[PDB]
Write a protein that holds these residues in place. Structure first.
Motif, PDB file in Angstrom:
ATOM      1  N   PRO A  17       1.607 -51.203 -35.157  1.00  0.00           N
ATOM      2  CA  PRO A  17       2.676 -51.022 -36.145  1.00  0.00           C
ATOM      3  C   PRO A  17       3.972 -50.397 -35.615  1.00  0.00           C
ATOM      4  CG  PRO A  17       1.127 -49.234 -36.344  1.00  0.00           C
ATOM      5  CD  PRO A  17       0.592 -50.138 -35.255  1.00  0.00           C
ATOM      6  N   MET A  18       3.996 -49.936 -34.366  1.00  0.00           N
ATOM      7  CA  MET A  18       5.177 -49.257 -33.835  1.00  0.00           C
ATOM      8  C   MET A  18       5.834 -49.997 -32.672  1.00  0.00           C
ATOM      9  SD  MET A  18       6.062 -46.217 -35.269  1.00  0.00           S
ATOM     10  CE  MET A  18       6.587 -45.134 -33.937  1.00  0.00           C
ATOM     11  N   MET A  22      -2.408 -52.142 -28.347  1.00  0.00           N
ATOM     12  CA  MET A  22      -3.621 -51.373 -28.085  1.00  0.00           C
ATOM     13  C   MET A  22      -3.811 -51.075 -26.590  1.00  0.00           C
ATOM     14  SD  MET A  22      -7.347 -52.879 -27.799  1.00  0.00           S
ATOM     15  CE  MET A  22      -7.507 -53.828 -29.314  1.00  0.00           C
ATOM     16  N   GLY A  24      -1.296 -50.694 -24.403  1.00  0.00           N
ATOM     17  CA  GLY A  24      -0.153 -49.973 -23.869  1.00  0.00           C
ATOM     18  C   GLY A  24       1.016 -50.854 -23.460  1.00  0.00           C
TER      19      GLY A  24
ATOM     20  N   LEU B 152       9.709 -46.698 -34.871  1.00  0.00           N
ATOM     21  CA  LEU B 152       9.476 -47.785 -33.904  1.00  0.00           C
ATOM     22  C   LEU B 152       9.832 -47.306 -32.497  1.00  0.00           C
ATOM     23  CD1 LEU B 152      10.892 -50.761 -36.018  1.00  0.00           C
ATOM     24  CD2 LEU B 152       8.564 -49.852 -35.943  1.00  0.00           C
ATOM     25  N   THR B 153       9.617 -48.139 -31.485  1.00  0.00           N
ATOM     26  CA  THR B 153       9.843 -47.670 -30.116  1.00  0.00           C
ATOM     27  C   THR B 153      11.318 -47.408 -29.829  1.00  0.00           C
ATOM     28  OG1 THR B 153       9.850 -49.974 -29.295  1.00  0.00           O
ATOM     29  CG2 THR B 153       7.796 -48.731 -29.108  1.00  0.00           C
ATOM     30  N   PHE B 188      13.170 -44.132 -28.766  1.00  0.00           N
ATOM     31  CA  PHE B 188      12.269 -43.120 -29.305  1.00  0.00           C
ATOM     32  C   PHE B 188      11.092 -42.992 -28.353  1.00  0.00           C
ATOM     33  CE2 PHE B 188       9.155 -42.028 -32.996  1.00  0.00           C
ATOM     34  CZ  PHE B 188       9.194 -40.700 -32.669  1.00  0.00           C
ATOM     35  N   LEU B 189      10.368 -44.094 -28.189  1.00  0.00           N
ATOM     36  CA  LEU B 189       9.324 -44.195 -27.175  1.00  0.00           C
ATOM     37  C   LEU B 189       9.852 -45.105 -26.077  1.00  0.00           C
ATOM     38  CD1 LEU B 189       6.318 -44.659 -29.613  1.00  0.00           C
ATOM     39  CD2 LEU B 189       7.535 -42.563 -28.952  1.00  0.00           C
ATOM     40  N   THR B 191       9.587 -47.119 -23.149  1.00  0.00           N
ATOM     41  CA  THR B 191       8.517 -47.805 -22.442  1.00  0.00           C
ATOM     42  C   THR B 191       8.930 -48.168 -21.017  1.00  0.00           C
ATOM     43  OG1 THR B 191       9.234 -49.922 -23.379  1.00  0.00           O
ATOM     44  CG2 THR B 191       7.531 -48.692 -24.573  1.00  0.00           C
ATOM     45  N   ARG B 194       6.995 -45.140 -17.987  1.00  0.00           N
ATOM     46  CA  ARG B 194       5.576 -44.901 -18.215  1.00  0.00           C
ATOM     47  C   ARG B 194       5.127 -43.597 -17.564  1.00  0.00           C
ATOM     48  NH1 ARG B 194       1.275 -49.242 -18.267  1.00  0.00           N
ATOM     49  NH2 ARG B 194       1.787 -50.185 -20.293  1.00  0.00           N
ATOM     50  N   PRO B 199       1.823 -44.837 -21.775  1.00  0.00           N
ATOM     51  CA  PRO B 199       2.715 -45.897 -21.281  1.00  0.00           C
ATOM     52  C   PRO B 199       4.173 -45.774 -21.737  1.00  0.00           C
ATOM     53  CG  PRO B 199       1.488 -46.713 -23.140  1.00  0.00           C
ATOM     54  CD  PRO B 199       0.982 -45.315 -22.889  1.00  0.00           C
ATOM     55  N   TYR B 200       4.647 -44.549 -21.933  1.00  0.00           N
ATOM     56  CA  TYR B 200       6.029 -44.326 -22.341  1.00  0.00           C
ATOM     57  C   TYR B 200       6.376 -42.852 -22.238  1.00  0.00           C
ATOM     58  CZ  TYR B 200       3.612 -42.963 -26.610  1.00  0.00           C
ATOM     59  OH  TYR B 200       2.759 -42.377 -27.516  1.00  0.00           O
ATOM     60  N   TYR B 216       3.812 -39.287 -35.197  1.00  0.00           N
ATOM     61  CA  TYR B 216       4.177 -40.690 -35.053  1.00  0.00           C
ATOM     62  C   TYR B 216       3.047 -41.459 -34.385  1.00  0.00           C
ATOM     63  CZ  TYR B 216       4.841 -40.355 -30.020  1.00  0.00           C
ATOM     64  OH  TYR B 216       4.633 -40.188 -28.671  1.00  0.00           O
ATOM     65  N   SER B 221      -5.563 -44.226 -29.704  1.00  0.00           N
ATOM     66  CA  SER B 221      -4.736 -44.756 -28.628  1.00  0.00           C
ATOM     67  C   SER B 221      -3.884 -45.926 -29.138  1.00  0.00           C
ATOM     68  CB  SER B 221      -5.605 -45.189 -27.438  1.00  0.00           C
ATOM     69  OG  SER B 221      -6.533 -46.179 -27.821  1.00  0.00           O
ATOM     70  N   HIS B 222      -4.122 -46.340 -30.381  1.00  0.00           N
ATOM     71  CA  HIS B 222      -3.317 -47.383 -31.008  1.00  0.00           C
ATOM     72  C   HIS B 222      -2.146 -46.696 -31.713  1.00  0.00           C
ATOM     73  CE1 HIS B 222      -3.249 -51.316 -33.619  1.00  0.00           C
ATOM     74  NE2 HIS B 222      -2.107 -51.081 -32.996  1.00  0.00           N
ATOM     75  N   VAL B 223      -1.002 -46.675 -31.039  1.00  0.00           N
ATOM     76  CA  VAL B 223       0.142 -45.855 -31.447  1.00  0.00           C
ATOM     77  C   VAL B 223       0.629 -46.181 -32.854  1.00  0.00           C
ATOM     78  CG1 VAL B 223       2.517 -45.192 -30.898  1.00  0.00           C
ATOM     79  CG2 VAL B 223       0.891 -45.598 -29.070  1.00  0.00           C
ATOM     80  N   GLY B 224       0.639 -45.163 -33.710  1.00  0.00           N
ATOM     81  CA  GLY B 224       1.093 -45.318 -35.079  1.00  0.00           C
ATOM     82  C   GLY B 224      -0.021 -45.413 -36.098  1.00  0.00           C
TER      83      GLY B 224
END
Lengths: 32, 466
Positions: A17-18, A22, A24, B152-153, B188-189, B191, B194, B199-200, B216, B221-224
């Motif tokens: 969602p961001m 999964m 990376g 968001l990133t 924000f993130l 990438t 890394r 990874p960011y 956030y 490990s699944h961001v968000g």
């Protein structure tokens, strides 16, 4: 539904969602 | 001509004329070149409230999102109209304090915590579990006023954000906002940097880090994705170096509106006000336009009710003199159109008399046995306010002269001296020197110990024959 582009963005992203998948990796930012 | 130069200088103290409600537009009739950039705007009205400043939310994006009746703006609840924070002049010393309903037990640093507007997470698409907006946010009982660190990133996250929302917005300009474009996004993130851990590298759309904010990332490990464990300590912007003053801080707000999500019925974030710290250079976006809320329904300092809004009001103290309340629509000529941060030592407000003399303005009111700080504070509280309900309190006073009983107000006694405050609603044209006085405006910081001289062009001998 009225929404702006940043609201819609996670629903188009290849890596919701961001925008980070999964594993990376990132985006295709518009995958559909 | 000294008289012309004096008038040009003193224009910066004409608060009702210059503390205006402007909107950005390339066809606006007002303009100013600051550095290499010519800014263009329209002045919708003058005399915006100084204590509390509001104007109608203006959205010139192609979709006009935040002008919709279904757009939630925090002021609809707290003030009764969809208002953005307004006022073209930076307001030195002004902090949004969390208080009890009577103004007591004020907390002037609580604002630094993020808001809890029931927004994050905005989406949980593809996550193992769902969560309601609000689930990732700081607990309601510690809610502050600061906008979310990022979303968001990066912004613009995709080219549609940039081309459909930003570039076709009449308030957006790709040169002014060259740090948030397709080719140069605001990270924000990040990438592209890394780490061994992730990874960011984490930054922020605003702020210099260290604040309590929304989770956030979530615990997985699944961001968000849920679950969340706020508060999360924020990081700083990747590059804040161009934000050198309060006007540059307003540009950060101007340019980042479309970085935030809006969906019908939810909070619509646009033209956000900001806090600038003169000492550290930190620019922090605020998530709420509300500047004062003291209704019977306001939450006093702590609550769990996510549908409630906290009791808040603007405050200035000597110690807050490094802080600046900045609206998104700050005028780029503010150094010559607005008052400076510091009070003016050893002078009295006046108007020109017989060409080359100055006579003191006629006081509307006075306060006896006050400190200089109290003079500046009460001036602020008696100045002007939008939102109707404070009209019985504010009086239209934007200038005060403090006269110490027996202290030279440029000396160390200035911080504790008592004396008389004289309040004015007349636009000043000159200054009179005096050893025992100090001059304040409603936009000035209130620490007498930082007071400095005006430009000597302002000062004339007193007409003592009046």
């Amino acid at each position: 539904i009225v929404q702006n582009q940043s609201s819609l963005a996670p629903e188009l992203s290849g890596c919701p969602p961001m925008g980070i998948c999964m594993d990376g990796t990132i985006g295709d930012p518009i995958a559909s | 001509s000294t008289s012309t130069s004096r008038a040009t200088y003193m224009d910066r103290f004409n608060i009702p004329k210059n503390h205006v409600d402007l909107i950005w537009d390339k066809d606006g009739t007002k303009s100013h070149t600051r550095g290499n950039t010519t800014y263009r705007w329209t002045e919708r009205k003058s005399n915006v409230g100084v204590y509390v400043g509001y104007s109608e939310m203006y959205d010139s994006s192609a979709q006009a999102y935040c002008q919709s009746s279904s757009a939630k703006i925090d002021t609809k609840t707290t003030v009764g109209a969809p208002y953005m924070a307004a006022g073209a002049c930076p307001n030195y010393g002004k902090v949004i304090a969390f208080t009890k309903r009577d103004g007591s037990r004020s907390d002037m640093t609580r604002w630094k915590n993020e808001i809890h507007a029931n927004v994050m997470p905005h989406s949980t698409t593809s996550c193992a579990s769902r969560a309601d907006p609000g689930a990732a946010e700081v607990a309601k009982s510690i809610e502050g006023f600061a906008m979310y660190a990022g979303y968001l990133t990066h912004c613009p996250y995709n080219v549609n954000v940039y081309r459909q929302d930003m570039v076709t917005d009449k308030e957006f300009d790709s040169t002014v906002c060259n740090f948030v474009t397709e080719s140069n996004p605001l990270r924000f993130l990040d990438t592209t940097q890394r780490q061994s851990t992730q990874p960011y590298t984490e930054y922020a759309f605003h702020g210099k880090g260290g604040h309590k904010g929304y989770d956030y990332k979530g615990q997985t490990s699944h961001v968000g994705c849920p679950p969340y464990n706020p508060p999360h300590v924020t990081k700083g912007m990747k590059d804040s170096s161009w934000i050198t003053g309060p006007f540059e801080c307003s540009i950060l707000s101007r340019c980042t509106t479309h970085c935030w999500p809006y969906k019908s019925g939810g909070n619509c974030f646009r033209s956000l006000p900001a806090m600038f710290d003169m000492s550290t250079g930190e620019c922090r976006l605020l998530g709420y336009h509300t500047q004062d809320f003291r209704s019977s329904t306001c939450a006093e300092l702590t609550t769990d009710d996510t549908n409630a809004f906290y009791c808040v009001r603007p405050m200035k103290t000597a110690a807050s003199s490094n802080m600046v309340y900045v609206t998104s629509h700050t005028r780029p000529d503010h150094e010559t159109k607005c008052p400076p941060r510091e009070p003016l030592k050893n002078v009295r407000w006046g108007v020109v008399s017989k060409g080359k003399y100055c006579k003191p303005m006629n006081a509307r009111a006075s306060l006896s046995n006050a400190t200089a700080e109290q003079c500046g504070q009460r001036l602020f509280m008696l100045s002007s306010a939008d939102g109707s309900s404070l009209s019985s309190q504010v009086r239209g006073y934007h200038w005060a002269t403090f006269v110490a009983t027996d202290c030279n107000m440029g000396e160390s006694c200035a911080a504790t001296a008592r004396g008389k405050c004289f309040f004015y609603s007349t636009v000043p044209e000159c200054l009179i020197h005096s050893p025992t006085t100090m001059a304040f405006t409603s936009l000035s910081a209130v620490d007498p110990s930082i007071a400095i001289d005006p430009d000597s062009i302002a000062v004339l001998p007193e007409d003592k024959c009046v």
